Design a protein around this ligand. Structure first.
Ligand code: NAD
Ligand code: NAD
Ligand code: NAD
Ligand code: NAD
Ligand code: NAD
Ligand code: NAD
Ligand code: XE
Ligand code: XE
Ligand code: XE
Ligand code: XE
Ligand code: XE
Ligand code: XE
Ligand code: XE
Ligand code: XE
Ligand code: XE
Ligand code: XE
Ligand code: XE
Ligand code: XE
Ligand code: XE
Ligand code: XE
Ligand code: XE
Lengths: 231, 232, 231, 232, 231, 231
């Protein structure tokens, strides 16, 4: 039994019952195989240097993530990436956490099908990064469209070559709570109770974090990866 | 502005984040129209006499229902229906809760999902005069991710179309079908249901080891009360 | 009860039973809610300055629309828009009619999901026009794809905000009869009997209205709204 | 070039613009093949003994069809079927018309939609030899918005496939689904059906209040003539 | 590395390129996992006592299967099952082959989604049988409807419990050369060249194997398993 | 009864069972109408000047095609195109074969829906060519998506006008053995047995024809037709 640490890189703008649900799913799955033992889950909010449209301050995303995991036994938040001045490629974030653990459980990227399929977006990922991520760390991709993910893997010689290191976990409970729809809801003043944890909902309301204004941040700006990989 | 009470009659076996979500959605919709003011939400678990397959004992359901709403300022649980000896037609439950409020009165509206609305078509499941009285004298607030289907269903029925002003279809754009069936199945397999139900409900289920192959077989082969009654 | 005037701006190239049907449905719906009284329907053909491809001359489209409503006891044609020298924004046509009335029924725009959704085409509609149209006048969107329309409304903050003034009318008897299909059938010599009013059909035949030639009109030209919100 | 007569057997309860289009489309298609010449169209309302649910008196349906075709240069109404005390099988109506033409003779083909074609699979509705003789000795011109389905249906039936040269599937690219059922529903609800049926038909219907809750109940609980007779 | 024998029970009425393809796919998948070595493939035609409608005599089906595998280096036909007088439960056919080997490679059932899904048909399979098959042997399900097969496994407690002994193999190159379609094609005189091995094709033509008559076989008769488990 | 010659122009990179099926289907269909007699089938591999990505040498494609039709009674391979130093438009290939016959059966282009639909790709086919192909020769289009091909025809005035020369043939036994998927399987060391003829699979295996390298042939080069028609 290989000891494993699930590392989820994402914006968590805001984290929702779905992001937490991701970790629960992956763990049951990996433990389920019998060849693994999930020892820890790490949430690592992206730094504001990412420049994603509508992205609020990493400070709030970390806090929410922390509040969301306050009662979680095995999942926690790591603020290293967010406190970085420069936007860090996910490969580097994976590396950092592997090297950290050697101061040995293997670190795997926890993600959804959107992330996996974004590999095809021109210039979004350095192709070597793709190879090294799946080759040297591996993905645990959770999804409600298991077949599209499986099809995407089958259509890429690189992903197919390292398929033993890419695990597609089916989500049979059609979870669709996206960050975007949560933000839309708040702007219109609708309830989001039961879509995010109580403390996260309470934290958000109290400070009216999301608004038309916030949704506008980085508007007109190129996504970090895109700028760096074209420049 | 009309004050209104949303009454959700269901099995809640078990209740999940989605049932709680149904109430939040319906209240936002109603208050948002500008002509209503939602004052209270009432969860009324069905009596064990319903005989639905896999239906665990009514008392546990009420508790999880109460646990899930312990921190709910406006939604509460009512045990009147579950305490009755014979299975209770939804129309009577609605009536009971309306008479009860008249003691300037708020109106009780049946809160439900599309499946319940559409079940009106199952032969011998609902007495036709009951449907008529429900939509005419109380009304339905139907939450669902299949809006056209609910609208179509209503459109295909003369009685529903006729009382269409008393039937409100509320769209759930943030789909999340956390159904009881899938929760029960996850539990039978020792999978986590954390974040699918409120923490206290999860824990309650844990401790009492509520769901299993055994519980799921309850009533196996027994005809559903309504069907049994309405056919006799 | 609020009196209302249904106004439909469009090309009507050519008007079909579908357009007339649109008015009947919107009227039934608005009078059905119990809180409106539809006192009139107005068809306003777009001027040739619109420059849409295949658009035949305005006078032909006005006459056909007039022939079509000759036997309507409540729907009529208004030629203001079509007589202006420069193409006119729909907000301007709505405003013209609302004022002409105040010389009071409320003018509401009658349209299909199509136009509703063109609100998203880059540079087709000025964002303030949309806000003013939905907030100050109103929209009655008649369509077969009700969920698509509802969804479109849900996905936009302005529309959602003024949703109380937007009405989606389900067309349960799915009819299509698009102008494009009618011109296509005419080019092929196929029968359009029962798809348009006999008088319109007879006129189309008398003047041999539609052909490959007519179809090339404004070929290459940039649609007025676009030329204007760009240029 | 083979001269053809398009015969449409149906309830026409009531006739709508869709039934008229049907003839237009089929005529264009047959003439467009370069191998046929459509000389006449025939609308044949079914007699009351068919016993279909909601079927109003035959005499009215006949009058509506005549009103509907008053301005048609080539489609006409035949009452033979409406005057039969015992419901007649479509194969018999086809034979009746062909024998009539015989009195260089045009061939009678059945004009219908996908619904009638696929109804061939309903248990007991059509005697198997009837299906065989109709497709082998007369022919079908099936108009539909679902061409692949109709082809699939044909492909899945040894008899249909065998005689596929006599079954013409005609694509309806301008979708039209003005069903009689949706027309009656509209009328019961006091909705406008203008532009969905010809003006004279709408006017006749409105003048005599032909469609209502009561008319819709006609023959409720009764078994459709073909089914009763083929199960006897 | 576990050695495995893929056993496929079926009617093979007639066998086709797709049944052969099934074995190739399963083999590539199982060997590809890096923890299996497929040492043999076994085609076990069903006996005539099965009474399935349209089912021609076993001797013709066995012979066609041998002609089909004459040129296979690893797939062969086993006639045991078909030589029995009473129709044999698939679990028994499996137990048989496993014991015959123990005279050790593990035998697994090779099948398509249909068979897997027919596990839900009332009275078709004894539930103890379903449990012993997946628990004691294994199922390699090859299919175009991967997610459906997966959903079906997810919806059954028995199958889910032993999911580790069940492998859904995706068939990215869609094939649907069903026997039913082959028979239908033969009845109408259509070519089946390139859908079945040339020798099978030649055999079918020489003995005029399929027709309306043959299709009538067992018409009205109750399929053996239903008869048994029911009476 | 008009005699007809089926001419399939294509890359055949490599030829598969599906291309062979195309001929069987088309022939059963045309002879089935009762008004045509299919006298011959011609497979015509494109020349290397076509420059399609992943196209291996013409000599090999021609050999695989010869190997595949060795035992065919009526389908042969014509090498004219493969020997052209300049890529030839399909209209010319049709004209080459038609005059050759006039040295009288009519040659018709056999193809699938992809090819037919490619008629709409900007600059791929000269409009006059499309016209002449369907006006003067004819297309027999075999496909799993008949309505899509029928709709494509209905939406084009030229195709519709000569619809009597375009025969859509339904493929009820769904088969999608694309060359792209065959090459994918080969690069991955997967079996392609029973998807292509035995001799073809053996020739491919013996020469390692398909690989990552072969797949890069012509990368970045513009397809002959596009280059020529844009120039
Ligand atoms: N290294 C690179 O080149 C590169 C390029 C682009 C992005 N990235 C990284 O990718 C991340 C982008 O994250 P994001 O903006 O989408 O974060 P997010 O907050 O939207 O989502 C976090 C994770 O949840 C998954 N997810 C979302 N909805 C889901 C659902 N319903 N079911 C299952 N999974 C679901 C997402 O696919 C993702 O893996 C960042 O960490 C970024 O740095 C890296
Ligand atoms: N009076 C009668 O004749 C009659 C006949 C049948 C049933 N009933 C009543 O109907 C109820 C049946 O309840 P049940 O067994 O389905 O309860 P349930 O616990 O499964 O569901 C509770 C409610 O949740 C809604 N819901 C579930 N998933 C949803 C989703 N994804 N989106 C939106 N809404 C969703 C359901 O429609 C229902 O209204 C009982 O109270 C019963 O007594 C009455
Ligand atoms: N003010 C602006 O910025 C702006 C920009 C673009 C367009 N416009 C206006 O929009 C109009 C464009 O009209 P068009 O060319 O599409 O007119 P049209 O003749 O094609 O159609 C007229 C109306 O019918 C509706 N319709 C058509 N088929 C329908 C169906 N099956 N169901 C329901 N509705 C259906 C259309 O959506 C539209 O509202 C013009 O008046 C133009 O000036 C205004
Ligand atoms: N001989 C027999 O055994 C047998 C058995 C059953 C029915 N029938 C005959 O079938 C007829 C039943 O007619 P009905 O009740 O359905 O009549 P109807 O008035 O509803 O329909 C008339 C025709 O319109 C076609 N149609 C409907 N919608 C269409 C659309 N959108 N596009 C194209 N075509 C469309 C229908 O398929 C039908 O052929 C009667 O003549 C009856 O006697 C005969
Ligand atoms: N033990 C029991 O209770 C029980 C009950 C019913 C059936 N059975 C057994 O099941 C078998 C039934 O076989 P059949 O008549 O369906 O066999 P078949 O000849 O049609 O097919 C043989 C195999 O091919 C698979 N297959 C067919 N087309 C496929 C495709 N396109 N993709 C992938 N796989 C495909 C089928 O699922 C099957 O496993 C018999 O051996 C029978 O005895 C056992
Ligand atoms: N004259 C011109 O302007 C012009 C322009 C482009 C292409 N072309 C010609 O078109 C051909 C292009 O061939 P290709 O590279 O696509 O050939 P290919 O080898 O991929 O396939 C050959 C044929 O098989 C058909 N086919 C493939 N999969 C099928 C399936 N599942 N079902 C049914 N049919 C199927 C294709 O549609 C095609 O007609 C060449 O001959 C080329 O010269 C001519
Ligand atoms: Xe999730
Ligand atoms: Xe609920
Ligand atoms: Xe919900
Ligand atoms: Xe309109
Ligand atoms: Xe319409
Ligand atoms: Xe007029
Ligand atoms: Xe918008
Ligand atoms: Xe029609
Ligand atoms: Xe009669
Ligand atoms: Xe049939
Ligand atoms: Xe297969
Ligand atoms: Xe198989
Ligand atoms: Xe094919
Ligand atoms: Xe060449
Ligand atoms: Xe085209």
């Amino acid at each position: 039994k290989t000891e494993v640490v699930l590392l989820a890189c994402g914006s968590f703008n805001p984290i929702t019952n779905m992001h937490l649900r991701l970790f629960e799913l992956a763990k049951d799955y990996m433990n389920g195989t019998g060849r693994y033992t999930v020892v820890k889950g790490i949430i690592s909010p992206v730094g504001d240097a990412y420049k994603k449209k509508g992205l609020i301050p990493a400070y709030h995303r970390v806090i929410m993530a922390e509040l969301a995991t306050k009662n979680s036994k095995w999942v926690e938040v790591d603020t290293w990436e967010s406190l970085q001045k420069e936007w860090k490629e996910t490969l580097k974030v994976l590396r950092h956490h592997q090297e950290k653990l050697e101061a040995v459980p293997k670190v795997k990227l926890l993600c959804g099908a959107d992330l996996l399929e974004s590999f095809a977006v021109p210039n979004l990922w350095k192709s070597e990064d793709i190879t090294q991520i799946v080759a040297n760390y591996g993905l645990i991709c959770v999804t409600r469209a298991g077949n599209d993910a499986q099809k995407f893997i089958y259509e890429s010689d690189v992903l197919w070559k390292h398929r033993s290191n890419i695990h597609v976990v089916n989500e049979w409970i059609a979870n669709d709570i996206s960050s975007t729809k949560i933000r839309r809801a708040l702007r219109r003043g609708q309830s989001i109770r039961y879509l995010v944890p109580d403390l996260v909902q309470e934290y958000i309301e109290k400070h009216n974090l999301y608004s038309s204004e916030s949704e506008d941040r980085n508007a007109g700006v190129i996504l970090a990866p895109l700028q760096r990989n074209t420049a």
